[PDB]
Amino acid sequence: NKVLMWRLLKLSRPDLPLLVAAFFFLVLAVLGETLIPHYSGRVIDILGGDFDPHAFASAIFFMCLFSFGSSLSAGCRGGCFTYTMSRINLRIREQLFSSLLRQDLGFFQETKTGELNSRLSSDTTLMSNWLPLNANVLLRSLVKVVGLYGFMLSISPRLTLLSLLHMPFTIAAEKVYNTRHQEVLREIQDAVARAGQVVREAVGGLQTVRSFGAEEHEVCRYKEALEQCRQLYWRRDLERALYLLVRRVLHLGVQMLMLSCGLQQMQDGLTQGSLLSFMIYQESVGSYVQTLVYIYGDMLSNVGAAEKVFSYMDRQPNLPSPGTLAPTTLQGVVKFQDVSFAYPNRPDRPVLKGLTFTLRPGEVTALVGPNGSGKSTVAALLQNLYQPTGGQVLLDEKPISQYEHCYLHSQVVSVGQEPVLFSGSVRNNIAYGLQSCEDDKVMAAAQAAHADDFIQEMEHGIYTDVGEKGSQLAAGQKQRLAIARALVRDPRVLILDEATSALDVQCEQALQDWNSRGDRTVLVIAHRLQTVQRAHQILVLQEGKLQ
Amino acid sequence: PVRRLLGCLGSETRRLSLFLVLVVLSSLGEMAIPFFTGRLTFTRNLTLMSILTIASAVLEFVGDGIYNNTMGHVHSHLQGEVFGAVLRQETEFFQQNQTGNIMSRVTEDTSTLSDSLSENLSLFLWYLVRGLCLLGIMLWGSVSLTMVTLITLPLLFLLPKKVGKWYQLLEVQVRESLAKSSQVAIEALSAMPTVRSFANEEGEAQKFREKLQEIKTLNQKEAVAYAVNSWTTSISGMLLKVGILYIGGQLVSGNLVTFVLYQMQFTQAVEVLLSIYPRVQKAVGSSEKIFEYLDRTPRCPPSGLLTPLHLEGLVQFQDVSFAYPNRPDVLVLQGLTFTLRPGEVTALVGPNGSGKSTVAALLQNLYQPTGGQLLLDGKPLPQYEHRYLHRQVAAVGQEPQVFGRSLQENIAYGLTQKPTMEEITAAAVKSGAHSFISGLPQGYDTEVDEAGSQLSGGQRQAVALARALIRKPCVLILDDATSALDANSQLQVEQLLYESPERYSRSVLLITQHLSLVEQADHILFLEGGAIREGGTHQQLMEKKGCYWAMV
Amino acid sequence: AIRILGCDPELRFHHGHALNIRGLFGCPKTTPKGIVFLLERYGGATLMLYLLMILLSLMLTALMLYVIEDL
Ligand SMILES: Nc1ncnc2c1ncn2[C@@H]1O[C@H](COP(=O)(O)OP(=O)(O)OP(=O)(O)O)[C@@H](O)[C@H]1O
Ligand SMILES: Nc1ncnc2c1ncn2[C@@H]1O[C@H](COP(=O)(O)OP(=O)(O)O)[C@@H](O)[C@H]1O
Ligand SMILES: [Mg+2]
Ligand SMILES: [Mg+2]
């Protein structure tokens, strides 16, 4: 549609200097090609007629240099068209990914990661790869249409039937093909993205797949998805071939129609010398108009096939306006005021029915409850990951959402129930998200989390590569690096969402001194009361209510 | 290298041969108009040119339909076999290659190769037949000058042959740079709650941009390469035409005009053909990795052919030692020797990082021991059939993965035939998951999200336990499963471990770094530093050393 | 002469499929009457002017390739 095409022009705005340069070289290339056939024809006349070595040598000389200029000009416009294709592609890819990170956490429950990656990797090429092909044909045909019409204007009376016959036929019938060609392109992109998720699941969780011997089942599932894509390719190609067949029949019909009308005006007085030469000009300009219309329609269909990419890029996240507070000192007093919450992707099931607890610096507060009670959902609200549907959450008597995004997550940190690491060095996992951090601070955090014992034994020590999602570490070793990642930030408020569960008996007793400094605010989440004996305040949660 | 590409297309030569006869017939009808028609004075020209135009349009319509249909089969076949070859590789293959890197190769590299093959093959055949027709006309004009043209023609191959190697290595770097960027994107998108929590959104975006910059550097060289290639083919073609004209002029044989008028056309076909070779080399570089997967021999031993009708759960380790291939010089396990017997529960206890989960990996035949041997019912694990072995041996991982489908499909995952709901319900009841699954609004039909993000922390182990029980397994492995379970589920677990009559059909390996459930085990093994330091019953271990240093 | 290729062979193909350019009657004459006269009288000067425009276009594009990187 025109809206998406206009949006791309706004995105293609920085690249205009490359486009105008391409147009100038295109004109210069076609400017030469109308001069070479004169000299080549002159060579034929000299060779077959009265031969003359000097005229022959002069004729082939001018033929070479005009051909050299056109070849030189044509080479560099192909080059700049190809380059400006990649600039559009990379800018499109960078802007799309940067927009996804800004979305709310409810967005990533509605979508699959393998579909987003496939859409980012595939739909972006479909939206840019048409540039070096469509633009060259569209501009070259447009120039030649004007040039050929100039010759026919010397036979003006027959020209006024040129613009009346073929023009209304193609413009009206094109909308039927354009509407349906765009539809199948969208189906193809969705089907290939749907097939991409199969590879994402099979490869991402292979050790579970191989544990049950289900590799051949996954291959059968993928081949079923490929078959659904094959039938969509056939429909796209079969209908285009049929559409191409109709036009040339239609082109031939207009041809006979004019030749008959060409001979009808013959009786009214324009000689056959004009008509014989005119019909060649009539033939070519009719073909170029058909090509000009076809390329323009194809250009719009390709842009419209990637409609979902535009919808992702301009999607405003369902988040409150960014905060600005960033005090130089923070006491760390957190309190709930009748907080009620329901997940945005599934309302009508309230997870929290109302909470009114408060946290104080230097006092360890314990939260206990069975599975599904809502303990981790409370921790998410502490970190401003989700907004409560009722009540409010305050930090130092100010709303949690009013604090700056970068500032807040440096004062309030947490350790997840099942920690996730990233591919990289141990010193990168630790001090994750910090713009600058010295190695003495990192080692201090490792010692505080009792991680220095096993980090020393690694192949490169603190610089050893952690596998994908932490797959190259033990479960307890993963848990310790997650604790160090929080301690390295010197937090004011610390949340422990069952972090001690995966650690052995010795470490679960060693890491009981969270409040030794006396300035931090500590919240510990546990499943059973046999873990929080020295907690200063104990909260019991069941069915979303505190007892 | 080129033969490796066209080798796949050779499986369907019959369809292409039918395409070849149609295009040459369509070409003959198209060239018939200039040869036979005068467009002067008349009806004779009009009718035959109208009929031949329709015949050309119909013939090329059928030819294109066969071509597009055949290309679709080749694309789907190639993409299916690449994915099938990936899953045959060893477990170490998926640590050397990230999940975002592999998926880019299967999804995009394969589709680029077939897309490249689709456009060039039809264009190559079309110009080949017209070039031959143009050559035949030139033979009529002059036998001597055609031989001169043909003799000097191989000299034009030299320069595109040099550019071709530039395209290969240039395309390989572009493909692997896109794979690196894909890994960065999918790793961040799969962990957004952690990225959001640590405010690293702009840190991920910057890490993504460093990969696009590498692509941008290569794309600049691609644009220059195109212009160089476009300059050389056009300029070289001009010299071939001009050189013959100089010879023709030096030979004045007054009929040279009919040879020249078509020589100027033959060079235009050669100019197009010389542009095909650089993109053929590009396709070779654009598919190095996918063809590397297709012919790489996996590190695993082949699956054996043993499927006993009835099997006993007698599992015995014999001097087993193991070291991960990432650090083959550091042994993770040292001289393990213990036996599992039907009807008995063995508890494996040790500190974090002692190697307990590594023991479970060996038993599931994910890795091969570097020393000793491991036997199931007196036979090595590789001797059993792959699907048969993973029905007798089932396990619950330390953090079980849950696929994005319905709960009934997750419980019955990997089974050869779909069980009835009566079997699934029984398995869910036995694992305790029925207490909460029945409370869901859609019950067993509820779709779960990626990696089981919808389920609570402790409920995921209950669903994974049901998945293992439904196999009617002979060996059951419980890796840290019982920690997060409810009181109701814990009663069910200790009921199935120590009370249920179906115990005698099973041998159980219980792994937990806590004393929560190991008191009732028939045997306890203490693992530290990759070796078993102490072994015996609960009372025997108490008398061995005072307070055991692990419970007081 | 017989035109075995198309009248505009560069536009004969789009992707892997043919286009509607063929010599249904013949190849149009694209040499205007003014130009052919100009190509023999004062013809030698037009070649120099044509080449100079190419050289100026090359020099201008290279500068834009420099500016657009710094911008
Ligand atoms: N893919 C791997 N490559 C190399 N070494 C590994 C890999 N996975 C684990 N290790 C190492 O092997 C050793 C044993 O780890 P393992 O996961 O078996 O311990 P564990 O006893 O199960 O631990 P936990 O009780 O904490 O779950 C550790 O030193 C660990 O770092
Ligand atoms: N991302 C989500 N989207 C929708 N519902 C969720 C999501 N995460 C959890 N829930 C539901 O909300 C409830 C919150 O429970 P949870 O806080 O996970 O308990 P615990 O932390 O004690 O295991 C769960 O019952 C779960 O079904
Ligand atoms: Mg473990
Ligand atoms: Mg929880």
Distance B482 CA to ligand 3 centre (A): 14
Sequence spans of domains, chain A? 1-101, 109-116+152-319, 334-546
Residue with tokens 């030096």: B250
Contact A481, A452 (CB under 8 A): no
d(CA B282, CA A429): 39
Residue nearest to ligand 2 atom 19, measured at CA:
A372
Contact A122, A193 (CB under 8 A): yes
Name the class of domain A109-116+152-319.
mainly alpha
d(CA B54, CA B44): 16
Contact check, Cβ <8 Å, B118/C9: no
Contact B513, A477 (CB under 8 A): no
Sequence spans of domains, chain C? 1-28, 31-71
List beta partners, residue B510. Answer: B347, B478
Count the Cβ atoms, other than its own, within 10 Å of residue B371.
15
Locate B241 and state its tokens. 């035409």
Please give the DSSP secondary-structure letter assigned to residue A155. G
**DSSP per residue, A402-431:** GB-HHHHHHHEEEE-SS----SEEHHHHTT
Count the Cβ atoms, other than its own, within 10 Å of residue A80.
26
**SS3 assignment, position A494:** strand
Contact check, Cβ <8 Å, A370/B197: no
List beta partners, residue A398. Answer: A395
Q: Choosing among B67, B122, B279, which should be mutated to test the C contact, i.e. which has the most C CBs within 10 A?
A: B122
Can A109-116+152-319 and A334-546 be said to share one CATH topology?
no
Phi and psi at B354, nearest 5°, equal -80, -15
| Ligand index nearest the alpha carbon of residue A479 | 1
Q: Choosing among C27, C30, C52, C63, which should be mutated to test the A contact, i.e. which has the most A CBs within 10 A?
A: C30
Contact A101, B205 (CB under 8 A): yes
**SS3 assignment, position A205:** coil
- Enumerate residues 6+ apart whose C-beta is below 8 A from A83: A18, B219, B220, B222, B223
Q: Determine whether the shortest distance from the Cβ of A374 to ligand 2 is under 6 A.
A: yes
Q: Chain B residues with CB inside 8 Å of A479's CB? A: 352
Q: Judge whether A376 is annotated as a binding position.
A: yes
> Which subunits sit against A, judged by 3+ Cβ pairs under 8 A?
B, C
**Contact status of A71 with chain C (Cβ, < 8 Å):** no
Window 2-41 of C, Cβ < 8 Å to A: 7-8, 10-11, 14-15, 17-22, 24-32, 35-36, 39
**Number of B:C CB contacts under 8 A?**
46
Q: How many residues make up chain B in this entry?
A: 552
d(CA A53, CA A293): 48
For residue C20, give the nearest of A140, A279, A287 by CB distance.
A287
Phi and psi at B114, nearest 5°, equal -70, -35
d(CA A206, CA A227): 23
- Enumerate residues 6+ apart whose C-beta is below 8 A from A273: none
Contact B357, B398 (CB under 8 A): yes
Q: Judge whether B84 is annotated as a binding position.
A: no
List beta partners, residue A414. Answer: A495
The amino acid present at A85, given as its one-letter code, is M
| Ligand index nearest the alpha carbon of residue A378 | 2
Contact A466, A421 (CB under 8 A): yes
- Enumerate residues 6+ apart whose C-beta is below 8 A from B424: B408, B411, B412, B444, B466, B470
| CA distances for A142 relative to A43, A73, A428, C20, angstroms | 31, 18, 56, 15
Q: How was this structure determined?
A: cryo-EM
Nearest-5° Cα angle at A256, A254 to A262:
100
d(CA A154, CA A251): 23
d(CA A252, CA A451): 81
Contact A522, A496 (CB under 8 A): yes
Query: Among the residues of A383-524, which ranges form H helices?
Result: 405-411, 426-429, 439-448, 452-455, 475-487, 505-510
The ligand 2 atom at the shortest distance from the C-alpha of residue A541 is 22
Q: Judge whether A373 is annotated as a binding position.
A: yes
Locate A538 and state its tokens. 């104990």
Contact check, Cβ <8 Å, B137/C1: no
Query: Among the residues of A155-214, which ranges form H helices?
Result: 156-204, 206-211
Q: Chain B residues with CB inside 8 Å of A542's CB? A: none
Contact A153, A146 (CB under 8 A): no
Nearest to B482, CA basis, from B461, B463, B464, B502: B461
Is CATH 3.40.50.300 correct for A334-546? Answer: yes
Locate B38 and state its tokens. 């005068």
Q: Determine whether the shortest distance from the Cβ of B324 to ligand 1 is under 6 A.
A: yes
Distance from CA of A370 to the nearest CA of C (A): 59
d(CA B95, CA B78): 25
d(CA A27, CA A341): 65
Q: Max Cα separation, chain B?
A: 122
Distance from CA of B475 to the nearest CA of A (A): 13
Q: Judge whether B406 is annotated as a binding position.
A: no
Q: Determine whether the shortest distance from the Cβ of A109 to ligand 2 is under 6 A.
A: yes
List beta partners, residue B379. Answer: B376
Locate B86 and state its tokens. 């990936």
Residue with tokens 């006024």: A160
- Enumerate residues 6+ apart whose C-beta is below 8 A from B441: none
| Ligand index nearest the alpha carbon of residue A367 | 2
Contact A182, A304 (CB under 8 A): yes
List beta partners, residue A399. Answer: A394
Window 14-43 of C, Cβ < 8 Å to B: 15-18, 22-26
Of A454, A455, A460, A473, the residue with max ligand 1 atoms within 8 A of its CB, to mutate for a pocket test, comes to: A473
**SS3 assignment, position C4:** coil
